[PDB]
Every structure is written in C-alpha cells, then in structure tokens.
Symmetry: C3
Subunit: 306 residues, 3 copies
C-alpha cells in the first residue's frame, strides 16, 4: 500500500501481459532538460511499440512509483541531478525522509520483482571494482540479482570494473549469465571483454524459455542477459574504451589507489570524450529496450500457453 503502481502497469500484471521495468538514471544524468525527458519518452516508446508496457520506477516525495504518469516523468526529469542515487539499501531512508530517489539496479529489481515484473531493462550493471582484493568494493547489484528471481537485460559490464571477477562473483551467487548471440561476454562500450560468455542465448524466445523455466522452478536467483553493443555504435564505444584504457594507464603511472581510484578513472574519461559516453549509453539502453521488450512479449506467450 506504500507502493504506487500505475493503472496501465497493474492491469497488465493482472492479465499476464508483457511489462518491462526501467530504472530512473537515463533521466537523472542525461542531456540538459528537457532533453533527458525526451530520451526517457523515447525509451518508453520503444517498449510500447514492441507491444509491452514500460514501467519506469522511481521514488517521488517518498512514494515508490512503479509506472510513471506524464506529469511524474516530467517532474523527475526537471529535478535532474538533484535526486538521491538510491540503491536497495537506501530505499527505506528515502521513503522515511520523503525524498526523491533515482533507483539503481539493486533498488529497481527489488521493486520490479515485488510486483511480479519479470523483465528489467537497464544499461549496465554494477560489479566488482578493480583492486577489490584490497578494498572489497563490490556492487550490491550482484547480491541483489543472486536473490531476486528476475531477468536483467544489460549490455554487459564496464571495463572500468573488474569483469573477470564480476563474472566469478555472479557464478558464486548462482546468477545465470548469458551473452546474446555471441560466445564473448560483452564489456559495456565494446563487445571485446576478453572473457568467454559462461552461456549463450540466440533469440528473445530462447531468453523467454529460460525465464519461464526459472519461474516454474521457483528459483530465488535471477538472470543476467548481456547484449553486445550494436556495430553501428562501435566507433563511439571504441573511443570510450580507448579513453578508459588510457585513464587506467595514467592511473597506474600516478599511483592512484583506494577510494580515489574509481572516481579518477571516471573523471579522466569524460575530459577526453565529452558527450560521446552519454550517446553510447543511450544507444545501449535503447537496444536493450528493443530486445528486452521482445523477450517480455515472448514470455507472456509462454505464460498464456501454460
């Protein structure tokens, strides 16, 4: 009764119809207003055009909202960076303080699974940070997915993170990880992570069959589908990856360590590449929304045929 579900989303959920959850970060960190709103509308339209209902999730004035109205999407967008970045562990505090929160992967998948949404489209997922051996800095996204039965549709893991260790951690958490139409696990900006995909899926229908099986089994762990960046944005992605490897090199040369390591890398990449990173992120989210919506629709067919 604390959570507000939009009528479009609740009616779809009642009848087993396709719903795609979305997080509130394309909005809080996009282009200058009202361009971030326009991007959010464009992503929701991709979901709608493919036959699913988009369920953008955010917290507004302490109210968790699953499915946003036009007014709510506008309000969220005009707030811009002023919203609290809200991980799962932050939800109760944002509710208690009646704040506005843009939910991360861990928080969004909590709310999506709470109400029975099976497919959550994101950009990337958090992971094991570089030099986690000394810091233990590991995203709660990985824990959350290990104990929430939901499918996350991502473009992989950023090379700023430790991708091999992220994959190992996901194995240990019992998360099924599959690359989409590839034997290589994608990094976010490049298809080349250097890591073999632990498993492979080749169509939205393949994906839906795995989700359907997971639901029928009542497993409490989730699924990560990783969709490699489209070749039409490989130039933008390759630029970011080149800048990232340069930043990593400069970081080593200047002995940047500890809590300053990750923010230094992020900082240096933006100077070299400006807006191309956001452009790549938007292209990735839009690709994930397309394939994620097809997965959700294929799943609703399997559910109908039960």
């Amino acid at each position: 009764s604390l959570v507000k579900i939009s009528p479009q989303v609740s009616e779809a959920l009642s009848n087993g119809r396709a719903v795609v959850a979305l997080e509130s970060t394309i909005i809080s960190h996009g282009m200058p207003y009202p361009q971030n709103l326009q991007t959010a509308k464009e992503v929701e339209s991709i979901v709608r055009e493919n036959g699913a209902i988009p369920a953008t999730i955010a917290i507004l004035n302490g109210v968790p909202c699953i499915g946003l109205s036009e007014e709510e999407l506008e309000r969220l967008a005009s707030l811009g960076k002023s919203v609290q970045k809200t991980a799962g562990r932050d939800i109760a505090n944002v509710v208690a303080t009646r704040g506005n929160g843009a939910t991360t992967v861990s928080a969004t998948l909590f709310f999506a699974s709470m109400v029975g949404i099976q497919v959550f489209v994101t950009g990337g997922i958090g992971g094991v940070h570089r030099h986690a051996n000394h810091s233990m800095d590991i995203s709660s996204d990985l824990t959350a997915l290990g104990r929430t039965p939901i499918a996350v549709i991502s473009a992989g893991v950023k090379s700023i993170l430790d991708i091999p260790k992220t994959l190992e951690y996901l194995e240990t958490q019992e998360v099924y990880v599959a690359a989409y139409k590839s034997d290589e696990f994608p990094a976010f900006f490049t298809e080349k992570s250097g890591c073999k995909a632990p498993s492979r899926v080749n169509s939205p229908e393949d994906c839906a069959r795995v989700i359907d099986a997971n639901m029928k089994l009542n497993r409490q762990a989730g699924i990560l589908f990783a969709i490699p960046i489209p070749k039409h944005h490989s130039a933008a992605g390759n630029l970011i990856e080149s800048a990232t490897q340069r930043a990593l090199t400069e970081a080593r040369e200047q002995n940047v360590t500890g809590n300053a390591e990750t923010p230094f890398l992020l900082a240096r990449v933006n100077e070299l590449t400006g807006g191309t990173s956001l452009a790549a992120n938007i292209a990735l989210v839009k690709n994930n929304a397309l394939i994620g919506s097809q997965i959700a629709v294929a799943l609703s067919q399997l559910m109908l045929e039960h």
Copy 2:
C-alpha cells in the same frame, strides 16, 4: 514450540508494544559473579525505565529463551564463561546437545526476528578481520544482518577489525548503515574510525521512521545504527584505542600472522589496560540500550498510528 518466549515479551509483541532484544554476552564475560548479573539487571532496567520490554536471549539446557526470568538470568550469570559462544550456525547443535549458549549477534538477531522483535541492542558487531584478503575471516554477523529485517543498535566496529572493508561488505549485503548524530562512522572505543558514515540519522524518531519504512516495504535485509561513544567515556575508549594501535604495531614488528593475528591483538590489549575495556564495553551497551529503547518506543508509536 521449541522456543520459549516470556509472558511479558509475548504480551508486548501481541499488542505491538516496544520490545528491545539483548544478547547474552555482557553476562558471560562481565565482572566476577554476581557483578555480571548486576550489570545485566542494570541494562534491563534502562530498557524498562524508557518504556520498553527487555528481551534478553540465551539458550538454557537446549531451550532457546526469549525474555529471561529472574531465575534464568541468575542461572545464566552463575554459569559465567562456561557457556558456549553460540553463533547462528551453532544454534542447532547447542539445542541438540541440550547445552547452554550465549548467543552472538548473528544468533540473537535470528531469534529476535523470528518472533517479531524489531530492535536489537548490542555492544559492537563482528566484521571483516584484518588481512581477510589472505584469510577470508569475516563475521557471520554481516551475512545475517544482510538477510534479516531487524535493526541492530551498536556503537560501531572495533579497530581490531578492518573497518573500511566491513563497511564495504555491509554495502554489498544491502544493509543500511547510519551513524547517529555524526558524519563519521564510529569505531567502538573511539568516534574516530577515519571512515565517513555512509548515512546519518539524528534522533530516535529518525531511526524509527527508517525501520517503519523497511517493515512496510517487506525488505529482507536489516539495518545497522552506529552510536558513537559518549564523550564521558572517551578517556577510557582512547586508552583502549591507544593500546590497540600499540598492539597492532607490535604485531607487525613480530610478524604475527594467520590465525594467531587476531588473538594476539586481543591478548596484548588486555595486559596494558586491564579492566578499562570492560568498563568501556558496559558504558557503550548502556548508551545503546538508552537510545535503542527510545527508538523502539518511537517505532511502536508509528505502528499504532498505521
């Protein structure tokens, strides 16, 4: 039906009244009998005077007891160090062998949450040990709190442990961590850990609002509130911290490693400081009982107003 709940505690729980869980360690390792009993009575009295019901938890002759009678508290106290230190994973064995067990944070929070107690007052919580990178020695307290929806009221984490890594681990487990009336996460004996508080709460009512939100959301992860040592015991705490840093230094100089590392540190500190450590621990538990009881009462008001 295995667990025995005292009539005072069960009647309070039936009516949504304030209850504070307590562990059985102030007793098993306090001053010489009957001084450890007197300390336990003093802590329970602080809870009672503030309008809550104290629920001390222990296992006696294989019977988990939630809420102790006068006879039971006396019996437990006279046993002294003879009781098994009982972590969550030890409970079944202590029950099976019909033993006596003093429950740790992980075991106490299991029993407290089992019966619907929302607030558990402790001294400190276990954590990531120093050089866990080589040992993986990490307290089950952290795991337990990550999957039990209960608030633990603590004075932070001892500097004998690795506080930065403990904080990271708690983030990954989706535990909401907040310092009380400070931007700094407290170490146990000193307010100065060197780590920023990941979040802050400024009153018992703030705390209760977070717990209330967590309950309404049906989140399965818990909450750590960390209350800095009162200035009136900072001298005792500073002495312990000084002795701890000296022991850490001597440990490095004598290359103490592995399973001998943590017990060496504990051993050296006691020689230098004698009884002041226990005095500091008692002051901390009594402070946590005061604030914890106020939190529990404020929470019972929120629940009444639902």
Copy 3:
C-alpha cells in the same frame, strides 16, 4: 509440476520415511559403460540395505527427475560424459533447452530441499579455489548450502582447493560444519587437512539430532557433515594426495596461474595415478551413503517421535 518425483520417493516423503538424495556424477564420470551404471546401482543398494529410499537426481530431456527408474538410470549412464554438468544456476537453461544434465551439489541440493529431502549424500563439495584472492573463484555449492536447509554428507574438501578459506567462507555463510568422529577436518583423499574441525559429531544419531533441531528452528541455512576417508582406502588416498602435492609443486615451478591453474593440477594428478582417484572417489561415496542412510533413518525416528 515440472519436476517428476518417483512413486517410491513421493510415498516415502508423504509418510516421513527416510530418503537420501544422490547426485548424478558417479554416473557421468565413472568407469566405462556399463560399469558406471553398476557403481550407481551399488550406491543405491547401500542406501536401500540400510532402510532408506535412494533419490538419485538428474535432468533428462529437460525433465528434473527426483528418484530414477531402472530405465532412467540406464539411460543416464549410457549417455556418459555427454551430459551437461549442471550447477544450480544452469538448471533453468537445461530445462529450457530440453537437455540432459548431471546435477552438481548446488543443483542437487536445490531439488532435494524443494521436495523435503533432508539428507543429501555426495562425494566432496566444491570450495574456495587456490589463489581466489586474485580470482574470486568460489563454488556456488557454498552459497547454496548457506541458504538451503539440508544436510550434505561429504568426505570433506579436496586439497586441490583452499581448505582453510573454504572453512572460513562456510562460517560466514552460517553453515554448520562438523567432522565425523574426529577433531580434524578431513581433506577428501586424506584425513589430514591441517585444519581443526569447527565442530564434531560422533554418531548418526548425533547428526540426526542436529538436523532435527535445524528443522524445528526453521533456519534457512544448511549443514555440512564431513566424514574422513576409511583407513582401508588411506593408501589410495595418500597416493592421490602425494600426486596432488607434487602437481602443486610443479605448478609453482612453472608459474601456472589464472584460469589455467586449477585445470593443470587436475590434469597432472591423473597422469601420475590413473584410475586410483576414481577408486578412491567411489569408496568415499559408498562410505558416505552408509553413514548418510543411518543418519536419515535416525532422523525419521526423531520425526516419528514428535
């Protein structure tokens, strides 16, 4: 309705009678057909002779089977190595693709616990790999047991793995670990791991009392019983351990690291020792089946006496 339970197993479960779960690996990697089938029959017969019902678990043509018919055991055995090694996170994919899967400890304990089987006999359990500090390579067996209330009957952990870190990890996951009739935690092939047992049990009845307590408490974490290799196979085990320590030495000398480390060790041991490893594994599984069946029967008595 996706899972097929044999009539013998379902009738036993309905009436609280002794059932022992078994995994499908003695079969997929045993002696040349039909010798692997004969070994599987021999293990099931040990369970039957001791008064319990054997429940071998596998996935055949996408159907999870709990309890195999004569035809199914034969079919599984004739498939040999062609079956997918199926961890818990792989189950949904094997079901979705209608494949054949030999379930590992993590997958088998999921299915066993799903239907109410309390005792699962295996050979060994997976663990923390050597140099996990750099790789984070850790078996999902440990996670799975930390959140599944079932008893696993094993002969310990292989010295190819990092046994001290595996024990620490199990503590953190809240898994009760006990050595059978010893103060030393067994390695798989040798009773000498160099690690003290965190706890000890001295009879099948002791084991059953712990399981019974765990069930009554409704704890969601499981139990690992580790049974040291019988002295009558210590020569075979000692040979394997000697070969393992030699392989470890050669690995260090040739600087084998990363993802090549574990497979190199496994590879070298087989060249030096040929079939004695399988012989030792079979002896261990058969010993675990004997004691595991006694535990299951003793537990069914406790349940009858409730």
